[PDB]
Amino acid sequence: LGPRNLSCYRVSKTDYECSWQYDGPEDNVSHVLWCCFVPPNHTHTGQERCRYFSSGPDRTVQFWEQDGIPVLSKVNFWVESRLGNRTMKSQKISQYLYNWTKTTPPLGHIKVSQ
Amino acid sequence: MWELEKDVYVVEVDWTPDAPGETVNLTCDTPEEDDITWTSDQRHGVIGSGKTLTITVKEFLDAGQYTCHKGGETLSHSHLLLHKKENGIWSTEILKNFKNKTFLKCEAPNYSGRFTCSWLVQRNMDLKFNIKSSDSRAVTCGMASLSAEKVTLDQRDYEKYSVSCQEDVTSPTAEETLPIELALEARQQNKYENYSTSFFIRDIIKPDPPKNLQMKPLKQVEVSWEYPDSWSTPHSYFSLKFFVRIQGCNQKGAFLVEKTSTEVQCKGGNVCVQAQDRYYNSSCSKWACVPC
Ligand SMILES: *[C@@H]1O[C@H](CO)[C@@H](O[C@@H]2O[C@H](CO)[C@@H](O[C@@H]3O[C@H](CO)[C@@H](O)[C@H](O[C@H]4O[C@H](CO)[C@@H](O)[C@H](O)[C@@H]4O)[C@@H]3O)[C@H](O)[C@H]2NC(C)=O)[C@H](O)[C@H]1NC(C)=O
Numbered sequence: 001l002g003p004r005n006l007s008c009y010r011v012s013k014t015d016y017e018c019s020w021q022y023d024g025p026e027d028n029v030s031h032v033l034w035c036c037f038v039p040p041n042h043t044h045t046g047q048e049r050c051r052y053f054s055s056g057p058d059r060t061v062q063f064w065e066q067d068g069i070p071v072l073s074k075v076n077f078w079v080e081s082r083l084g085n086r087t088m089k090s091q092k093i094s095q096y097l098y099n100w101t102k103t104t105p106p107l108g109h110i111k112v113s114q
Numbered sequence: 115m116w117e118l119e120k121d122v123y124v125v126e127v128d129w130t131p132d133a134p135g136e137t138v139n140l141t142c143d144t145p146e147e148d149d150i151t152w153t154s155d156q157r158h159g160v161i162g163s164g165k166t167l168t169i170t171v172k173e174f175l176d177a178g179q180y181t182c183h184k185g186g187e188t189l190s191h192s193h194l195l196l197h198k199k200e201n202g203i204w205s206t207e208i209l210k211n212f213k214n215k216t217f218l219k220c221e222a223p224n225y226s227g228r229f230t231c232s233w234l235v236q237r238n239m240d241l242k243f244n245i246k247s248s249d250s251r252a253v254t255c256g257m258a259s260l261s262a263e264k265v266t267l268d269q270r271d272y273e274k275y276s277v278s279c280q281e282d283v284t285s286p287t288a289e290e291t292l293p294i295e296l297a298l299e300a301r302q303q304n305k306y307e308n309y310s311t312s313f314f315i316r317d318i319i320k321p322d323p324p325k326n327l328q329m330k331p332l333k334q335v336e337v338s339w340e341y342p343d344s345w346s347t348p349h350s351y352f353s354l355k356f357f358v359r360i361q362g363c364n365q366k367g368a369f370l371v372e373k374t375s376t377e378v379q380c381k382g383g384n385v386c387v388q389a390q391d392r393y394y395n396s397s398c399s400k401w402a403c404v405p406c
């Protein structure tokens with residue numbers, strides 16, 4: 001139960017999109033798409049910056065290259081679904097955006113173990 | 115980084131993650147010497163101190179307006195714009211191309227040097243446009259009189275901007291060796307692009323439709339017309355040809371007519387005429403139509 005299969009990708013030269021599915025009853029459910037990232041700067045402290053989209057009942061989010069989310073650096077995304085006062089979070093994805101398309105497979109990408 | 119206008123700078127960026135951003139310095143235009151703070155319209159709080167702020171610019175969150183302050187008073191501003199270069203191709207996304215895959219469509223009603231150049235955009239927010247002729251047939255365009263109208267293409271809405279231009283040194287009777295070269299600079303929020311175009315007046319010509327279309331029947335119909343007053347003179351040199359039909363030139367059921375006189379039979383419908391430069395395959399005119 002909860003939000004499931006989160007993916008985000010490029011849909012045009014400037015526009016991007018995140019999509020996800022939700023296992024369970026869909027009535028009176030609201031979703032909040034979260035995005036946090038560390039911007040390349042001159043600060044040595046991490047200084048994580050976060051943005052969010054409230055999409056209500058819909059399970060897609062549209063944005064574009066000038067909305068404030070980096071597309072050439074690693075970003076983290078997850079979905080928080082609300083039913084009543086319970087919030088169900090999705091698993092976190094960590095990816096670039098510029099080289100992802102609607103057909104890019106969500107699994108099978110290399111990850112660095114540190 | 116190069117300067118576009120006063121305190122407006124363009125930063126060219128490669129649209130790859132591996133490319134480190136362009137390290138650049140922004141100096142505050144002010145006589146003050148101490149306690150200078152820097153802010154950005156995309157970050158919260160002070161982002162640096164001193165009269166000079168050094169930042170690395172890679173993508174759009176690093177662009178925008180940078181402001182220096184002293185004790186709550188703004189000292190100066192500096193706008194950072196990005197010109198995207200992705201896979202070796204300078205960005206062409208602010209504008210939407212026409213049916214023939216061009217971005218700048220120019221039309222001239224005559225050889226006088228007057229012409230109109232138009233373009234299409236879909237996201238009509240935070241836009242700025244500047245056009246200029248870049249050996250050189252220089253033109254001046256009345257940007258101060260830029261206009262736009264809503265047009266629908268492929269069931270999608272766009273705004274068609276248009277600006278009138280005029281060749282500076284003109285000579286209509288003479289033939290053209292070098293073409294006119296225009297460049298439109300397009301800005302959308304923090305994005306910069308430019309589009310180039312070269313052409314001859316001969317090729318962009320689209321005459322006005324004929325005027326005075328009077329008929330005269332026979333036991334057979336004889337309808338005539340005459341040149342539009344916007345067409346170049348003398349008419350003996352700037353001749354026109356006509357295509358007459360009865361309901362890119364879109365001439366499919368018409369026939370070549372060189373003079374204004376024409377005999378025709380019409381059982382029903384509307385006999386329709388257009389115009390075109392006789393000695394060059396330029397654009398044709400909007401059809402003019404009279405009822406049989
Ligand atoms: C369409 O866009 C392209 C790509 O953005 C653009 O090309 C760029 O034009 C600018 C404007 O001239 C170039 O900037 C110059 O680059 C040279 C080479 O290093 C410099 O010497 C120049 O320095 C002058 O300007 C400085 C401040 O701007 C001064 O401090 C200095 O004293 C000089 O006077 C200047 O930086 C830039 O190099 C190109 N980029 C490329 C990749 O070619 C093109 O001009 C645009 N076309 C139109 C018609 O707008």
Ligand SMILES: *[C@@H]1O[C@H](CO)[C@@H](O)[C@H](O)[C@H]1NC(C)=O
Binds near residue numbers: 096099104110131
């Ligand atoms: C996108 O680019 C990054 C940086 O090179 C790379 O690590 C990642 O695997 C790429 N993703 C895809 C889906 O190609």
